[PDB]
Design a protein around this ligand. Structure first.
Ligand SMILES: [Zn+2]
Lengths: 104, 52, 131, 154, 194, 134, 343
RNA sequence: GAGACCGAUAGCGCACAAGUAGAGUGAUCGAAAGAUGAAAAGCACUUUGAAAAGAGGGUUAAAUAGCACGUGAAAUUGUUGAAAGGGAAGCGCUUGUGACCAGACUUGCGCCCGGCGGAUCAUCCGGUGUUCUCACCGGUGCACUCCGCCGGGCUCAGGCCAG
RNA sequence: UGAGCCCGGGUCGAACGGCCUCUAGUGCAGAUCUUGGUGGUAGUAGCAAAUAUCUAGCGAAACCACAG
RNA sequence: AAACUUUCAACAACGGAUCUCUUGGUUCUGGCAUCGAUGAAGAACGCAGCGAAAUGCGAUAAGUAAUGUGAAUUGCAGAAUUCCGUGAAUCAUCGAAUCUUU
């Protein structure tokens, strides 16, 4: 997906990417979820322009009634949360192993 | 014909989904898990200069 | 030494199929099992000398479920890349070439599987030996 | 493996067919069953002696109680009848097969009726329904026997 | 975000996933050290990863992926050539994958063992097929098979086999190919011919 | 992709328009490419075929056969080349219907109107060549 | 209706069916009337029937055969080119000097594929050829896999003349590989690979017989192409040249439209029954000399069909070395036309 | 101009002769019915006979695609082969007999000599791409090391069932 | 366990399948169910609208869970 | 013994399901506004070489004129009808005409 800035790049690049099978073009001010997650599957490959990044900084402060959401988790790395000196220090000794030997 | 064909979604939830999709697009394992051939792509948010 | 893994002996609790009640009499009734829903149906009430119904007690051991008599599990393959996925599972899985695979692609799959040490169930398909 | 009984050579057989024939299926089937397995000239004389009235055709499966005479003593069936049109159609197909065997180069004095099959034809849409039939008969030659020669010593 | 991409891969959709009805899922990714979809074997949901792959030349390499090149899909893997000596290659895997998870080390040794065993088996198989000379070829296609069946039926009809044999035997009997006093036929039959 | 709203990408309408076309539209549809030498000579790629052209068949079981077009059967959407015929059961030699897309015109039946067609096509191609050059 | 399809002109199925039925009635009645009138005029004038018969001949694919305008693959007639030269075989005897100074008595070794299951079928095929022994190729399941070249060398060292390999498909015979081992200092010779398609043992044949130990006589019919001459000679060397005529046994390999029908009969020269006709000769009736004499035949051997698929220089593909590795290979595109035969 | 529609018992009653055929004094009621083949190349000719029919023979990639035409289910029917039965058949569990069909572990690795050839061997030389320390080529040679290939030698491991 | 699924053999001739989601005119043994096709009765009753016996030709209907 | 009845397999029938197809339907959307006493909608009778149906047309009758294109129509039969031409066509456009009985 080609994301461009129509103010700084113009709309002539839309014509040159039209016939190439598969490639799509979208302005940075009118991004489409149907194109960013095709089929409901996340992770679309995107070629940006430089002006696309600068106006991508710009247009998320211009939406009225919307601010960029704050996550309920600060550090999403669970291995950093659990395997850290902070938590490992207060942990009681293990009560068993991953595999329990059969007693009788 | 008076079946409900269209779905009203809150604009806040649509902007949340668009921002989540944009954030997911900057992660390369998600790009290959979606099915994109990016093994020769130098950086996942593939920024090219506007002069090109 | 090349065979399947060491596995516990394969025990089938029942080898026959569960036929639908009165399906041998009517040609409009397929033999696929349907649970009887009538109140006085003696198959449903489990009277003596009648059909048994499928129960969870008839289930197979989890260590030998889905396992062929040779000890392998069937793995459906459509191309050569699919048999390559059994490089590390040559003793646990056997290749089952799909029914719509052409002859030359079948030759490619059989050749690669032999090199990988993977058994093919239908290697006597539309191929023949040339001297 | 098991091998099926191979067919006899096409140079030793002669086939005749008749399709969508306007005769009753049951009477034609019984007439064909009566002459099944016989020699060709015997079947010719029987059908010509059932077209003009001397000889009877017994019925076993599609048997209707119509006549009870002595002509069924030779077949062991107490129910005997005389269909006429089925005899004419069987006669026509038998001379057709005779012409086919004469053209092919078979000895017409040693022809036997290997098999004769009467199948049902599509019903004539006119509630009264007609019952046409297909007939497929195959005549063969009598099996030939050759005396062996004594084996040689080595 | 290893856990978040793992949740997205495992619970929603992955293009490298083969779901079988036999109790195991498989990973179609080429860099998977074991072709199984589970948490430890995922090449995508693990930022630090290691696998062992064999080139078409036959040289076997160890591929190592770190988190600091994770935004560089063209620079994800560093490739290290493994020795032809099996024990020295095992020690090379031990030396390069130091301080890695033990699962990755164990699966790398197992994959190297299986690749060397497959190479030896391939050499033995190639020698055996070179000695025997056998080769699998496709059977006749259904159109060609139908063509041969129909034309063989027509050729058998046009052959007139028994008539041809009888005619050629009578022709051999006429021209004296069996000689005077033939052992084939009765003396009266030979008298009638003359 | 089509942009003009008057164009239809319907398979149904396209098939109906193709198989229920008038004779002049069928003439336009039954067109054949020119040979390489004629393409460099007249600067024209393809022309509607006509009786009297000499063609070479480049597709089908009658490949590399040459001959003069003796019939343009627009109803059956086929042309009849000279000596590319068949045999019936009775022995009659019937022509074999070859689509005009399967042949290449090696010699044109040059009249005044055909020269006008060639001139118009050449003028359009050269004016687009001028537009591309500058 | 010989030029027009009613299905492509009438859009209604029922109307087209009614029109076709009426056309069949009219055409059948007119054709029967025309033939009855013609027969009445043949009865009036019995001379123009002969001109009608000699002018209106039925067609045959054999007469429509396409030849070529000689080296192992040219579709030519050797006898007719020979008669052209009398009024351009040498390439065959140059390429195959061992097959083409009489050959010795043949000893045949018959085997199967690797894990062969056709033991009775291969034993019967060996029982076809005089002086033929059948040896299995693997003994048990997990023994040594001998190659065709090794077995050919082993049988060459033991005095065998030729090696026959019967290859199975679905537990039925499918391919026949004939290798000529030659003798003295000559290497093992050409390899001919045929396909067995319609195999039936003697028991399957209704009204059959049991063969004896007499040497049969060969009826190799309709071989004209140099490839066909090579196949006929390869079948000829497998059998002894002198047949024991006391036991009237005939082995027939008849080539028709590239298909070689193999049969085996026993015969007797008997007097004709008075309803039998005299035997018609080829291209003209009344076989001169045997009018009233006919041959009775009884099948004592298997019915099989062969089609030559490959001719190799050595023992198979692995064994043929130089640029003249394969002598001839069958391709389906060579049977693109139904009147083109390779023999 | 289109569709997350229907696909010939569906979708308009009507994909085709459809408000037609046909019914009713009339107002009105109102069907069934699509597919040969790429191309008719729509089966010449010989021979039975009175048929909307056959046998040879031909066209076709194919006619068991022949204007009864793509494929061709079941109900129901005929020919052949096998088995059983004559005061019901059919079903569940368990052996036996006959016929037919399948074919068990895909059946390997490691050491010790001799010869040969390559290299990740040579602190050998030159070049290329790089994540800048890892890969890939080209040329040298076998002192060491490591791989293979060939000829000998030895050990071991091997699937199932009985006692 | 099961609803089911996979492979072999034959026929055939132009499209189709798995997985993750979405969607619905989505699963039949019965409704004196609808439409089509096909039976025993039955070559029987009778020769009747349409098309006093024996023998040719023509030839139904009621009824039918399976049998006495 | 033979005959009959039942089950299974192969082949051959009956029948038209399934699969695949679709110049058809159905639902939505957009531009536009145009029947008739200057005789409408509808009904009937006729016009072609072979016309059964459908369609077109009206005694100028599967049509005439004018314009445009540029070499056919076509199932069979016929044309000395036209191919550097005011010119084929079961062609398209269409401004001029003909237009039976109701
Ligand atoms: Zn995964």
């Amino acid at each position: 997906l080609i994301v461009y800035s129509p103010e700084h790049d113009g709309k002539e690049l839309v014509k040159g990417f039209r016939n190439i099978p598969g490639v799509e073009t979208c302005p940075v001010d009118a991004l489409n979820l149907l194109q960013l997650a095709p089929g409901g599957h996340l992770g679309r490959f995107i070629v940006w322009t430089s002006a696309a990044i600068k106006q991508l900084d710009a247009v998320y402060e211009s939406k009225k009634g919307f601010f960029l959401p704050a996550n309920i988790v600060s550090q999403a790395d669970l291995s950093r949360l659990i395997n850290s000196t902070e938590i490992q220090s207060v942990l009681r000794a293990p009560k068993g192993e991953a595999r329990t030997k059969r007693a009788c | 014909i008076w079946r409900k064909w269209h779905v009203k979604i809150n604009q806040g939830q649509k902007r949340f989904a668009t921002a989540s999709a944009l954030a997911a697009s900057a992660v390369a394992p998600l790009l290959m898990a979606r099915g994109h051939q990016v093994s020769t792509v130098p950086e996942v948010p593939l920024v090219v200069d506007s002069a090109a | 030494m090349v065979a399947a893994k060491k596995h516990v002996p394969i025990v089938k609790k029942r080898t026959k199929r569960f036929m639908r009640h009165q399906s041998d009499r009517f040609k409009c009734l397929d033999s696929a099992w349907r649970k009887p829903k009538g109140i006085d149906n003696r198959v449903r009430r489990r009277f003596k000398g009648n059909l048994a119904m499928p129960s969870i007690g008839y289930g197979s051991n989890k260590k030998t479920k889905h396992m062929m008599p040779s000890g392998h599990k069937a793995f459906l393959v459509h191309n050569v890349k699919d048999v390559e996925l059994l490089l590390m599972h040559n003793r646990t899985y056997a290749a089952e070439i799909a029914h719509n695979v052409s002859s030359r692609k079948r030759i490619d799959i059989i050749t690669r599987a032999k090199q990988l040490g993977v058994k093919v169930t239908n290697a006597k398909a539309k191929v023949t030996t040339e001297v | 493996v098991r091998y099926a009984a191979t067919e006899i050579a096409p140079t030793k057989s002669a086939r005749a067919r008749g399709s969508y024939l306007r005769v009753s299926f049951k009477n034609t089937r019984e007439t064909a069953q009566a002459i099944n397995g016989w020699k060709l000239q015997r079947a010719l004389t029987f059908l010509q002696n059932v077209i003009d009235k001397k000889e009877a055709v017994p019925m076993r499966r599609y048997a209707g109680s119509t006549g009870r005479t002595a002509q069924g003593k030779q077949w062991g069936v107490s129910r005997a009848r005389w269909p006429v049109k089925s005899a004419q159609f069987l006669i026509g197909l038998l001379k057709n097969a005779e012409a086919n065997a004469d053209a092919k180069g078979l000895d017409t004095g040693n022809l036997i009726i290997k098999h004769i099959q009467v199948n049902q034809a599509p019903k004539q849409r006119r509630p009264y329904m007609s019952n046409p039939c297909h007939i497929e008969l195959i005549l063969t030659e009598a099996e030939e026997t050759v005396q062996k020669s004594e084996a040689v010593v080595r | 975000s290893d856990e978040i991409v793992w949740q997205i891969i495992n619970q929603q959709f992955c293009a490298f996933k083969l779901k079988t009805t036999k109790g195991q899922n498989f990973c179609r990714n080429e860099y998977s050290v074991s072709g199984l979809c589970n948490r430890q074997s995922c090449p995508l949901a693990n930022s630090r990863y290691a696998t062992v792959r064999q080139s078409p030349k036959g040289t076997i390499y160890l591929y190592i992926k770190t988190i600091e090149r994770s935004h560089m899909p063209s620079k994800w893997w560093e490739k290290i050539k493994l020795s032809q000596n099996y024990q020295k290659a095992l020690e090379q895997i031990d030396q390069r994958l130091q301080f890695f998870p033990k699962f990755l080390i164990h699966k790398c040794k197992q994959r190297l063992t299986r690749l060397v065993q497959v190479a030896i088996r391939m050499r033995r198989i190639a020698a055996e097929e070179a000695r025997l000379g056998e080769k699998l070829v496709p059977k006749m296609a259904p159109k060609i098979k139908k063509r041969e069946e129909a034309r063989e039926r027509k050729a058998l009809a046009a052959a007139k086999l028994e008539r041809t044999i009888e005619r050629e035997l009578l022709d051999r009997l006429r021209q004296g190919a069996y000689g005077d006093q033939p052992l084939n036929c009765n003396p009266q039959i030979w008298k009638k011919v003359l | 992709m089509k942009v003009r709203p008057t164009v239809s990408s319907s398979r149904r309408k396209a098939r109906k328009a193709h198989f229920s076309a008038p004779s002049s539209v069928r003439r336009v549809i039954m067109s054949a490419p020119l040979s390489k030498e004629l393409r460099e000579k007249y600067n024209v790629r393809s022309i509607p075929i006509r009786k009297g052209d000499e063609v070479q068949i480049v597709r089908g079981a009658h490949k590399d056969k040459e001959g003069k077009v003796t019939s343009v059967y627009r109803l059956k959407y086929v042309i009849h080349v000279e000596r590319v015929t068949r045999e019936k059961a009775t022995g009659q030699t019937v022509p074999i219907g070859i689509h005009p897309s399967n042949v290449v015109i090696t010699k044109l039946h040059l009249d005044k109107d055909r020269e006008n067609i060639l001139a118009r096509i050449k003028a359009g191609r050269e004016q687009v060549a001028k537009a591309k050059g500058k | 209706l010989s030029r027009v399809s009613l299905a492509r002109t009438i859009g209604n199925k029922l109307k087209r069916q009614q029109l076709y039925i009426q056309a069949k009635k009219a055409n059948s009645r007119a054709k029967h009337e025309e033939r009855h009138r013609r027969r009445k005029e043949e009865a009036k004038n019995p001379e123009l029937k002969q001109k009608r018969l000699e002018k209106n001949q039925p067609a045959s694919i054999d007469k429509k055969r396409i030849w070529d305008d000689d080296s192992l693959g040219a579709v030519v007639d050797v006898a007719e080119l020979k008669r052209r030269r009398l009024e351009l075989p040498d390439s065959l005897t140059s390429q195959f000097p061992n097959l083409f100074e009489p050959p010795p008595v043949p000893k045949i070794l018959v085997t199967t594929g690797i894990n062969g299951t056709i033991h009775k079928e291969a034993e019967e095929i060996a029982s076809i050829f005089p002086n033929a022994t059948y040896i299995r190729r693997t003994a048990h399941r997990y023994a040594y896999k001998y190659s065709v070249r090794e077995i050919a060398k082993f049988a060459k060292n033991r005095g065998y003349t030729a090696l026959l390999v019967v290859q199975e498909d679905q537990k039925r015979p499918s391919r026949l590989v004939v290798v000529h081992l030659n003798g003295e200092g000559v290497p093992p010779g050409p390899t001919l690979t045929y396909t067995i398609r319609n195999y039936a043992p003697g028991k399957a044949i209704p009204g059959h017989g049991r063969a004896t130990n007499h040497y049969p006589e060969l009826l190799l019919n309709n071989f004209k192409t140099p490839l066909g001459l090579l196949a006929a000679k390869s079948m000829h060397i497998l059998f002894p040249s002198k047949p024991e005529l006391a036991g009237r046994q005939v082995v027939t390999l008849h080539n028709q439209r590239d298909y070689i029908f193999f049969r085996r009969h026993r015969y007797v020269f008997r007097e004709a029954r008075p309803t039998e006709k005299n035997v018609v000769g080829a291209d003209g009736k009344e076989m001169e000399g045997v009018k009233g004499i006919r041959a009775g035949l009884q099948e004592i051997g298997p019915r099989m069909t062969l089609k030559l698929r490959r001719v190799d220089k050595g023992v198979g593909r692995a064994g043929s070395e130089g640029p003249d590795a394969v002598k001839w290979e069958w391709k389906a595109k060579m049977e693109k036309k139904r009147t083109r035969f390779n023999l």
